[PDB]
Amino acid sequence: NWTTNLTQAEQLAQLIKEADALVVGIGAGMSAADGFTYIGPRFETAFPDFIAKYQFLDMLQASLFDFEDWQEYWAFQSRFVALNYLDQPVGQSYLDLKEILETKDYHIITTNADNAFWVAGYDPHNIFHIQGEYGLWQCSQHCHQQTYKDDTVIRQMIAEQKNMKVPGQLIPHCPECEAPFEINKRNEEKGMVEDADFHAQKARYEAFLSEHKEGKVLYLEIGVGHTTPQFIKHPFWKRVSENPNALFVTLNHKHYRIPLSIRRQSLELTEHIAQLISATKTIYQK
Ligand SMILES: Nc1ncnc2c1ncn2[C@@H]1O[C@H](COP(=O)(O)OP(=O)(O)OC[C@H]2O[C@@H](O)[C@H](O)[C@@H]2O)[C@@H](O)[C@H]1O
Ligand SMILES: [Zn+2]
């Protein structure tokens, strides 16, 4: 029953059913599993200019690169936003997970910044985008705590750029301090602009955690790696340690070693996320 000869999907379906509540942590693996990849042909097709000039290995690296000027920054990012936010289609695993979660008390924290939850029709009140969203902008000097958006300008930038540069007059500027806008993204050194909406999401997430300090709480970690373990992986480990009745279930095709404190409360499921979620949904629905 509630315990870490069944298939991975059978084991997952049963735990979800049995859980009092689910705390679901989603990282880049879930998007990669639906084909929203950041290395290979998807990246090569979309950015052959930038790859030819900078020898970028992957789209994450390129999205973090300190470009020479804001004209180049916005040429790259406008296209990046269109690929992963304006025009990214619905992923089947986001739809399959949503159906499973419909019958459960749950909350989601995600380090992903793509459109995946929105095109899959999730209630925004149930999701905490701790790393911001590609569709949003912030003052590059973080001069005040407000995010902005303007998809029309993004499309202008895609249309008007040439030679990896947006025309200067199209670069958007913070109305308070006139610094250029940048993507709402968390820097290690400078942090992230966290506006009223961000704090509302955080408070909802913290509320849910406060309500589920006890009981059969399933901490379900999907496609979370080592890139930024401080947001999901490590906090989950700690929650599971602090509640002896919690379980830690990680959906990941690579092995990340689990702390000694929670070895007996942990389960690693290595099946390809898309396949696993699909098979789990099928079982869970019978
Ligand atoms: N099909 C799959 N099935 C199962 N696991 C998978 C699959 N595809 C990828 N994974 C796993 O998903 C994980 C992705 O890890 P990272 O690339 O570290 O992604 P993430 O944990 O989300 O960290 C990314 C960090 O950088 C920022 O872009 C982002 O905002 C976040 O803070 C890896 O452990 C990988 O093994
Ligand atoms: Zn400003």
Side-chain angles (χ1 to χ4, degrees):
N1 61 59
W2 193 248
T3 181
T4 45
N5 303 298
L6 306 170
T7 62
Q8 290 183 42
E10 292 166 348
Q11 191 154 18
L12 188 52
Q14 295 197 1
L15 287 161
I16 296 174
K17 178 58 144 54
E18 195 175 8
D20 294 330
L22 285 79
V23 184
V24 182
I26 291 160
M30 190 168 176
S31 283
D34 280 348
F36 314 133
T37 50
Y38 282 62
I39 192 161
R42 187 172 184 258
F43 172 51
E44 287 147 12
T45 305
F47 294 98
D49 42 357
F50 280 98
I51 293 164
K53 194 192 177 174
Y54 292 109
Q55 282 218 277
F56 288 131
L57 193 82
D58 68 81
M59 187 156 50
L60 183 62
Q61 173 186 45
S63 78
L64 290 169
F65 188 76
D66 188 6
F67 291 101
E68 60 188 63
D69 53 38
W70 287 100
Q71 283 182 262
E72 197 165 44
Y73 174 85
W74 278 112
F76 178 88
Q77 296 284 355
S78 58
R79 290 162 52 189
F80 183 91
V81 168
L83 180 58
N84 300 300
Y85 201 89
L86 297 189
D87 299 321
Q88 194 176 277
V90 71
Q92 193 60 46
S93 311
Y94 287 88
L95 292 177
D96 296 342
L97 185 66
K98 188 176 69 163
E99 292 194 34
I100 294 161
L101 292 174
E102 176 176 6
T103 41
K104 306 298 304 192
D105 295 351
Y106 78 92
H107 208 100
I108 287 168
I109 176 169
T110 189
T111 53
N112 290 350
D114 67 13
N115 71 355
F117 291 102
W118 311 146
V119 286
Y122 285 72
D123 188 341
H125 292 90
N126 295 334
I127 305 156
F128 175 30
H129 273 89
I130 197 164
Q131 288 288 72
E133 298 198 46
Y134 299 139
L136 300 167
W137 299 345
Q138 70 190 10
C139 167
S140 61
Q141 303 266 291
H142 295 43
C143 82
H144 67 301
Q145 304 293 296
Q146 186 57 57
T147 60
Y148 298 76
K149 67 196 310 297
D150 192 333
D151 292 351
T152 299
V153 170
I154 292 295
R155 291 212 193 271
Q156 281 183 333
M157 284 180 158
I158 289 164
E160 299 287 347
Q161 66 174 267
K162 322 180 283 151
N163 312 132
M164 290 169 287
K165 289 190 187 303
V166 163
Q169 79 268 16
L170 256 68
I171 292 174
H173 291 93
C174 166
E176 300 300 309
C177 79
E178 286 294 282
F181 274 131
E182 65 182 16
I183 303 296
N184 174 223
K185 183 188 302 294
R186 189 180 299 277
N187 190 265
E188 297 215 38
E189 292 77 4
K190 312 196 178 299
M192 191 183 71
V193 160
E194 295 176 336
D195 66 12
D197 189 57
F198 173 94
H199 284 293
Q201 291 174 42
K202 176 161 168 154
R204 284 199 289 275
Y205 176 61
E206 285 173 0
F208 186 90
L209 295 188
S210 311
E211 298 167 37
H212 301 296
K213 298 189 209 179
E214 304 295 338
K216 291 160 107 173
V217 186
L218 174 67
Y219 288 82
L220 181 60
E221 185 201 66
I222 310 175
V224 168
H226 250 190
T227 308
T228 56
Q230 68 271 29
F231 298 114
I232 299 176
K233 197 183 287 289
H234 293 168
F236 279 24
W237 287 355
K238 293 178 175 162
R239 292 285 297 190
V240 175
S241 193
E242 290 163 2
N243 176 5
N245 303 113
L247 299 177
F248 179 65
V249 173
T250 181
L251 274 51
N252 203 303
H253 65 192
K254 293 181 159 235
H255 304 272
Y256 300 78
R257 206 162 75 197
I258 269 155
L260 172 56
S261 54
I262 64 170
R263 179 177 60 72
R264 296 204 209 158
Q265 293 163 268
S266 292
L267 174 63
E268 309 186 305
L269 298 179
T270 50
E271 183 173 345
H272 185 290
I273 283 163
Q275 275 104 88
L276 179 55
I277 289 181
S278 182
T280 300
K281 185 204 71 180
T282 296
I283 294 161
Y284 184 90
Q285 283 184 340
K286 283 160 189 179

